[PDB]
Design an enzyme around this catalytic site. Structure first.
Site, mmCIF file in Angstrom:
data_model
loop_
_atom_site.group_PDB
_atom_site.id
_atom_site.type_symbol
_atom_site.label_atom_id
_atom_site.label_comp_id
_atom_site.label_asym_id
_atom_site.label_seq_id
_atom_site.Cartn_x
_atom_site.Cartn_y
_atom_site.Cartn_z
ATOM 1 N N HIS A 99 -36.299 -42.622 -2.193
ATOM 2 C CA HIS A 99 -35.713 -42.484 -0.851
ATOM 3 C C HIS A 99 -36.765 -42.047 0.172
ATOM 4 O O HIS A 99 -36.720 -42.500 1.314
ATOM 5 C CB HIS A 99 -34.592 -41.465 -0.874
ATOM 6 C CG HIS A 99 -33.422 -41.852 -1.727
ATOM 7 N ND1 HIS A 99 -32.935 -41.003 -2.696
ATOM 8 C CD2 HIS A 99 -32.687 -42.990 -1.727
ATOM 9 C CE1 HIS A 99 -31.889 -41.618 -3.224
ATOM 10 N NE2 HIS A 99 -31.706 -42.825 -2.680
ATOM 11 N N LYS B 264 -17.343 -41.109 -5.278
ATOM 12 C CA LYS B 264 -18.449 -41.146 -6.244
ATOM 13 C C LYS B 264 -18.568 -39.835 -7.044
ATOM 14 O O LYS B 264 -19.415 -39.762 -7.935
ATOM 15 C CB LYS B 264 -19.783 -41.427 -5.536
ATOM 16 C CG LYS B 264 -19.895 -42.818 -4.936
ATOM 17 C CD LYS B 264 -21.313 -43.039 -4.421
ATOM 18 C CE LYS B 264 -21.493 -44.356 -3.713
ATOM 19 N NZ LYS B 264 -22.903 -44.549 -3.268
ATOM 20 N N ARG C 65 -33.841 -52.780 -4.341
ATOM 21 C CA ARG C 65 -34.275 -52.507 -5.704
ATOM 22 C C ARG C 65 -33.939 -53.651 -6.689
ATOM 23 O O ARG C 65 -34.801 -54.494 -6.943
ATOM 24 C CB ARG C 65 -33.709 -51.150 -6.156
ATOM 25 C CG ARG C 65 -34.379 -50.549 -7.384
ATOM 26 C CD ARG C 65 -33.884 -49.138 -7.678
ATOM 27 N NE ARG C 65 -32.429 -49.066 -7.853
ATOM 28 C CZ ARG C 65 -31.644 -48.165 -7.270
ATOM 29 N NH1 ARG C 65 -32.162 -47.228 -6.487
ATOM 30 N NH2 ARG C 65 -30.334 -48.189 -7.474
ATOM 31 N N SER D 135 -31.021 -42.096 -8.240
ATOM 32 C CA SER D 135 -30.492 -40.729 -8.371
ATOM 33 C C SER D 135 -29.757 -40.581 -9.710
ATOM 34 O O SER D 135 -29.915 -39.560 -10.404
ATOM 35 C CB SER D 135 -29.501 -40.441 -7.241
ATOM 36 O OG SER D 135 -30.176 -40.276 -6.006
HETATM 37 C C1 LIG Z 1 -23.229 -44.564 1.704
HETATM 38 C C2 LIG Z 1 -23.108 -46.116 1.574
HETATM 39 C C3 LIG Z 1 -24.041 -46.783 2.650
HETATM 40 C C4 LIG Z 1 -23.652 -46.470 0.155
HETATM 41 O O1 LIG Z 1 -23.709 -47.882 -0.047
HETATM 42 C C5 LIG Z 1 -21.620 -46.594 1.734
HETATM 43 O O2 LIG Z 1 -20.807 -46.241 0.594
HETATM 44 C C6 LIG Z 1 -20.955 -46.119 3.028
HETATM 45 O O3 LIG Z 1 -21.217 -46.748 4.047
HETATM 46 N N1 LIG Z 1 -20.147 -45.021 3.023
HETATM 47 C C7 LIG Z 1 -19.497 -44.479 4.232
HETATM 48 C C8 LIG Z 1 -18.048 -45.000 4.408
HETATM 49 C C9 LIG Z 1 -18.080 -46.506 4.560
HETATM 50 N N2 LIG Z 1 -17.978 -47.355 3.557
HETATM 51 C C10 LIG Z 1 -18.110 -48.606 4.090
HETATM 52 C C11 LIG Z 1 -18.105 -49.889 3.493
HETATM 53 C C12 LIG Z 1 -18.344 -51.005 4.332
HETATM 54 C C13 LIG Z 1 -18.566 -50.829 5.719
HETATM 55 C C14 LIG Z 1 -18.562 -49.534 6.294
HETATM 56 O O4 LIG Z 1 -18.811 -49.319 7.644
HETATM 57 C C15 LIG Z 1 -18.365 -48.444 5.441
HETATM 58 N N3 LIG Z 1 -18.287 -47.111 5.659
#
Ligand SMILES: CC(C)(CO)[C@@H](O)C(=O)NCCc1nc2cccc(O)c2[nH]1
Ligand SMILES: CC(C)(CO)[C@@H](O)C(=O)NCCc1nc2cccc(O)c2[nH]1
Ligand SMILES: CC(C)(CO)[C@@H](O)C(=O)NCCc1nc2cccc(O)c2[nH]1
Ligand SMILES: CC(C)(CO)[C@@H](O)C(=O)NCCc1nc2cccc(O)c2[nH]1
Ligand SMILES: CC(C)(CO)[C@@H](O)C(=O)NCCc1nc2cccc(O)c2[nH]1
Ligand SMILES: CC(C)(CO)[C@@H](O)C(=O)NCCc1nc2cccc(O)c2[nH]1
Lengths: 157, 160, 160, 157, 160, 157
Positions: free
Chosen positions: F16, F40, F89, F127
């Site tokens: 990261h 998670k 990755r 992680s």
């Molecule tokens: C942390 C992360 C980047 C890992 O990949 C992903 O889990 C995420 O963004 N979590 C925040 C909530 C969210 N989940 C979403 C799925 C699609 C579009 C969005 O705007 C989202 N917001």
């Protein structure tokens, strides 16, 4: 010719509607079969998922929506289905789908597992992704039938 | 009364192709096994040899028509009144190129539905290319081919 | 007293290949680094240049024999009494083609076991093809090659 | 030459038997090492998995079955093993296997992680898939050693 | 004042390439759309035709410079004072080769950062190769190309 | 130009740090955004993850570490970010990343999701993998910033 389109459909999305619509243009009768899938800890009960899919596919004359907790191969045999349909999205899906298809072939050799490809429009969506956006109050109206969007909001609110 | 097309170069037809076209005949009323001229690929067998081999190897399947074509596959599918396009899928490499092809074919002929079938585990790791390379280098490929194809390939390599 | 074969075109041998053959010598009693003529690939270096480069680059490894071959790899493996076939694996593309090859080799010679080794992270993104393309276009590839190979490649490109 | 074939083996399948048999034709001594893997919430206890694998590999003279809860690299060092074997099935497995191999190389540079390819017969199976079919009463006799099939049925009934 | 390079063969430039270069102009102050001679690929359009087509198709984007190059892409990037290298990513096949290329480019020019952009879903299944193959075989590719490119491609195929 | 580098960062690794460092060489201001991600079931609380990343990136002048429980697209809009960065990755990551990028484009069309490629050194870590090694007392000092290594050990001991 009877085809079965199985899945967890938790909930059914526009991607699933696209595949089942393509299946009705190819086969005389299509059974959209919703697996109970308790191991996946689904958001919606089996009864809720069947009602959502029934309402979402009501406009398609040759779709029958049913729920099942049986082995897929046994349910297909019992539905007199000889074709099993899955939508082909990503590599992870394709490889897992190959495993199920080879397992189903061992259990029921006359059941042909085939793949349909969704529209580019629905090529990057999934029930899991739509639920994740909805859990964060994001607009998912574009990805779901109207009744499903209302149900997802009611379940989360 | 659904008409399906199963296109390819079939240079030569293998047991993998026989497996796919057999599965297609169990699903669809009429199957056209369509053989592409494919000049840019520089085929080992001429179109006429490829058609005669496929005809002999599928003669036992009553609802298969073997036909050669030099046009755009979607133009030929349209002229044959086919609404189903059969593709055999063995692995990941197949899948990515097959998705590009299927979207292009959908753009060209929206009423033509691409359907992907899986061959037996027995033929899931073979291709016409690998069979040809092995046979050219004096390897035994008898297991992967219909008898008439094995005979034709031995005769082709004996003089080439 | 296991005999392993490590086949390839080695056009030219890279640090990635040296890494794989070094790992193989730590596992097996005798390793044959087998260089395929590979005429259909149109190699930059002739078989004899490829063998001499590999011999010099592996001279410090006491249980490596560098040998050229023009036959089917499995026919050569059989004649050499090899029961282990070494393949280097770097990524996804390697894996799918390697699976087809391994099943074909198993069909041809069932007693020959394919074993897949992984190179150091340092060489996990290189290939002879990419090294050649970069060097042809005046890029620095010194880091990816044994010293004798770097010298040979510079001399080849100076006159070509 | 000592090789270790590690995994969760929950339960051991015909796919695992195929890989371990290939490993014995290649190396003098093979340790089939069963990881406790509590994070994976295994169906069978470690003691059950070791007994199943011992019974399933009894016919192979140079296989030793052992259970472990240690770090893989430390267990390999402690077994005087210099080769770690994994079966190469799908892309998802291959990429995860690359990560473990590079991690094990950092922890124990002399431990060589290698891959063997299973027979076409077992190329589309996994413990997870066999358990899913068995949970739905589907016939899994073809995919498992006799003792494992009896144990899977006893655990589910 | 970041300068980005978007290299490729652009044989011919497609709506997929226009989509990527448009996204790049929204991120970076100056974008060089760099057209590689690429003789080993045997291009349909000459470098000068490829440059003129790209210039006309990007004329509405004020911070795009279309330039031809025959050298190693990293040598050209360095001479242009580019610190960002744009790559379009559509699928898995793109990704693996793109990773090898990006590591090689990082070895050649560490100060050049590879950044991967995604085209619209609309262009996620097309390539210049597939467009050319379809057009050569009398298929309709109008949807995938800028108007000037459609006109140029029709004229090229009318006489070839 | 404002870029957001989002993730669960449970905990932040050297992989990261490599991506965020590359992002600061490309963009004027970089927001390293830590998603709460309760689905998670993260090892470290959001407050712990933010403190670890703040300490780990303190040496980088133009990184701002923030935590969020909002929809990604809304948080990006609210941060005035027009670039979203993810490290590229493996295949499984790439395909999932395509899905999120297309979803984010539907929700916020002006937000450009881009990928950076990590150093070969960190190309096989995650992680999840570092936590698995650490749960078995394996040496992870090479893969983590000093403060994170201390925190991982304190959390497990
Ligand atoms: C942390 C992360 C980047 C890992 O990949 C992903 O889990 C995420 O963004 N979590 C925040 C909530 C969210 N989940 C979403 C799925 C699609 C579009 C969005 O705007 C989202 N917001
Ligand atoms: C819904 C589903 C299609 C999603 O992929 C799949 O989870 C499934 O089929 N669930 C029913 C039980 C079952 N699981 C099986 C696994 C292999 C062979 C069978 O006949 C199976 N039956
Ligand atoms: C042999 C083949 C079935 C295996 O892939 C395929 O190459 C093909 O279709 N060859 C005919 C010319 C053509 N090339 C095309 C490209 C996209 C869409 C078409 O309808 C095409 N027709
Ligand atoms: C160079 C190589 C090691 C890298 O892949 C491979 O191409 C090869 O083996 N070349 C020799 C001819 C041959 N082609 C074969 C195809 C399948 C089975 C064989 O034994 C083959 N032998
Ligand atoms: C069983 C297994 C081979 C399945 O893939 C893997 O879960 C494993 O090895 N479990 C033991 C603990 C451990 N996990 C580690 C991760 C990286 C490096 C190590 O030495 C590890 N030791
Ligand atoms: C057209 C292209 C942008 C698409 O991929 C790429 O092939 C390329 O860069 N062509 C120029 C010569 C070159 N070949 C190279 C190989 C590795 C590193 C370089 O800087 C290279 N330059």
């Amino acid at each position: 010719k009877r085809a079965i389109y199985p899945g967890t459909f938790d909930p059914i999305t526009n991607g699933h509607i696209d595949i089942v619509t393509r299946a009705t243009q190819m086969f005389d009768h299509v059974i959209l079969a919703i697996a109970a899938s308790p191991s996946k800890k689904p958001m919606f009960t089996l009864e809720e998922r069947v009602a959502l899919a029934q309402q979402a596919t009501a406009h398609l004359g040759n779709v029958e929506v049913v729920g099942f907790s049986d082995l897929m191969a046994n349910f297909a045999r019992n539905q007199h289905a000889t074709v099993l349909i899955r939508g082909l999205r990503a590599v992870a899906d394709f490889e897992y789908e190959m495993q199920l298809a080879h397992m189903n072939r061992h259990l029921m050799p006359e059941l042909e597992s085939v793949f349909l490809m969704p529209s580019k429009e629905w090529s990057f969506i999934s029930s899991s992704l739509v639920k994740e956006v909805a859990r964060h109050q994001g607009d998912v109206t574009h990805f779901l039938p109207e009744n499903v969007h209302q149900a997802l909001m009611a379940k989360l609110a």
